[PDB]
Amino acid sequence: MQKEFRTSAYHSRFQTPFRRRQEGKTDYYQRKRLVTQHKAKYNSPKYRLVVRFTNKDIIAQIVSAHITGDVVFTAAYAHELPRYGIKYGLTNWSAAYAVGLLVARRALQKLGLDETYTGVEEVEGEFELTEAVEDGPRPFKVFLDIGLQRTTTGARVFGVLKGASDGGLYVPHSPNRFPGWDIEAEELDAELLRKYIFGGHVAEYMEELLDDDEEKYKSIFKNYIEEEIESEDVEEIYANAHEAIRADPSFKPTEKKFTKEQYKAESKKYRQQKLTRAERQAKVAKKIAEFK
């Protein structure tokens, strides 16, 4: 009774979206506004903090855009945190702060801005932008890129923001999306934010769930029990991690159990082959013959 919609004209006149738009990964509106540079600032690139959250990892890459593709300046991953003393909760707000701090420190170390622009060592949770030093280089300026993730107050992307800003990068931002902002009274509750930086909310959950349902605590916090880390022992974990990151932020790759040749050799055993023309023709001819 109704027309068959999937016609060959519908497919012929269909304009496919950009490949990364149809994978639902790039917002090109936001990307245009982020990347485009003042034309009187001729070849000086704009820099982005890409912050991406998978189910098990946190990615922080400092990226500048080019015609043939984006170029990574430095990158930091949450799976590097076991080297700095954080083993569990690698998608926390606190791990997010640690990753931001790590990428900021690695960037400043690679750029030579270590002695100048140390950052904020005595972390108290106060909104603070990195300020330039007189008669000297301006701070490394990057712009936060959260991609498709929604802006909410108390979101982990702004935890990475806070870490990168405290590492000494200059990242423009306002404090009204940190955990602790009061909309009715527009001030930042700095104690609550500093609690979030040092894992305090996780420790509060540990205390409450131990006092209420020790079986649920047993299941959820099993890793902490195995290491016998109690709720009082978390702030030191994150503080020691911050100290270790600030002491040595150099990148160390995970040593490869095989080289690229072995890796390519092993996976090719599980790639299917394309049929050649002779083979598809043979299949067609046999399918005609069998049909009688």
Binding site: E23, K25, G147, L148
Partner: protein
């Protein structure tokens, strides 16, 4: 593994939506909102008319109906009370092609709601939405996609699941 017996293909209720389309506003729509708020334990939301029909005594952007969506244990409890009121009696017509179904109740007081002359009697509509694990891929913001054909729900499998789990009859 490529198996249909996998634990991730098991059907279950996504949501129940309670619908009362009283055709107008006033004390009737307020009362219907109150009865939904009691039955669901959740505040319901009014729906406006999308345009004006003089046969229906209805006006564009004028409050008429009220609905609430319910999911979780509450959804299945209200579902089984509704099927009791139906006496576990549904038809193959009730089941949609995609794999949902619903029915109609002429009185909430049949479900076990204490009768109140302040509120009275209101007919109601039930509609459950089926689904499997991984329906998030069509709902999330990032990397949204579609569900593969063998994972999709459908009429026949939903009738099977209903007859099995609820031990009812689907009068074909």
């Amino acid at each position: 593994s490529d198996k249909s017996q996998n634990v991730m293909r098991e059907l279950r209720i996504e949501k129940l939506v309670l619908n009362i389309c009283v055709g107008e506003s006033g004390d009737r729509l307020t009362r219907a909102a109150k009865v939904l708020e009691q039955l669901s334990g959740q505040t319901p939301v009014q729906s406006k008319a999308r345009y004006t029909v003089r046969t229906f005594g209805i006006r564009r952007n004028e409050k008429i109906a009220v609905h609430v969506t319910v999911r979780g244990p509450k959804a299945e409890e209200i579902l089984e009370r509704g099927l009791k009121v139906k006496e576990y009696q549904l038809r193959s017509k009730n089941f949609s092609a995609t794999g949902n179904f619903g029915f109609g109740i002429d009185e909430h007081i049949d479900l076990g709601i204490k009768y109140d002359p302040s509120i009275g009697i209101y007919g109601m509509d039930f509609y459950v939405v089926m689904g499997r694990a991984g329906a998030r891929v069509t709902r999330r913001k990032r990397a949204r996609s579609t569900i593969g054909n063998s994972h999709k729900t459908n009429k026949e499998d939903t009738i099977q699941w209903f007859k099995t789990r609820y031990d009812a009859e689907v009068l074909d």
